[PDB]
Design a binder for this molecule. Sequence first.
Ligand SMILES: NC(=[NH2+])c1ccc2[nH]c(-c3ccccc3O)nc2c1
Ligand SMILES: [Ca+2]
Ligand SMILES: [Mg+2]
Length: 223
Amino acid sequence: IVGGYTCGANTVPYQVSLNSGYHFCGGSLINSQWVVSAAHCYKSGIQVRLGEDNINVVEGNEQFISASKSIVHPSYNSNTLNNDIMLIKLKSAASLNSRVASISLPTSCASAGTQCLISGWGNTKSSGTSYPDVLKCLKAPILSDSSCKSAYPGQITSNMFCAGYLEGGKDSCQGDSGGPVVCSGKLQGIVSWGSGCAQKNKPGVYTKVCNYVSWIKQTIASN
Ligand SMILES: NC(=[NH2+])c1ccc2[nH]c(-c3ccccc3O)nc2c1
Ligand SMILES: [Ca+2]
Ligand SMILES: [Mg+2]
């Protein structure tokens, strides 16, 4: 996250870190047994780490649980990143408490202009590399589809939306993929892609979760 701030320990209690010997993507806890992340974060051998603040220090509020199964969206296209969403089931149910909580799925899609909270342990430099060990947060509004499509011609589908600032300076970045975009208390997006980080007229692109609620609900109930 570039141009964001330190969230605070366990202030984003639904945030998860996917680890395969190291942190490689974020995710969101939607209930005690399931996590939603981005399909491009798919790997075999994932351990989900809940209640994390610093990812390099065991501070006492963590739960490390291995995944029993991963389900990438049936229509995920790795070339365009259309339908960039996946579900991960935990081998054991997480214990929810103040530091580990689930986020609610939306009942409708949010409007352009709505402010959301984006979080993750990704790169914090637009031109450079600096990976933080504590969770970073960013409040950013959903942009109009017209500004999103003008920035990325022929690349935005109805399952994507842009959030951020066209001036640049603030954006999600590599290491943040699969993480949450929460607006009005609902999980409305998943960090998917962008062009570099925090560049002018190149906002971040997020998977539009409101279009997948029926698939998520149906899939977790059958697995
Ligand atoms: N600028 C952005 N809004 C952004 C967000 C997440 C990203 N994740 C990545 C990424 C790059 C290489 C491999 C995996 C990634 O998730 N680039 C990203 C760019
Ligand atoms: Ca830790
Ligand atoms: Mg994240």
